[PDB]
Design a protein around this nucleic acid. Structure first.
Ligand code: QUI
Ligand code: QUI
Length: 8
DNA sequence: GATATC
DNA sequence: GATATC
């Protein structure tokens, strides 16, 4: 759920 | 480092 | 299960 390097 | 909503 | 980036 975090949106950092992936954004899910 | 830099992590939480589906 | 469902994950990558400066
Ligand atoms: C988002 O809350 C979150 C938490 N754990 C994960 C594990 C693997 C892929 C994506 C994820 N997203
Ligand atoms: C993004 O590429 C990425 C990869 N690994 C992580 C681990 C912990 C927090 C954030 C992250 N972001």
């Amino acid at each position: 759920x975090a949106x950092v390097x992936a954004x899910v």
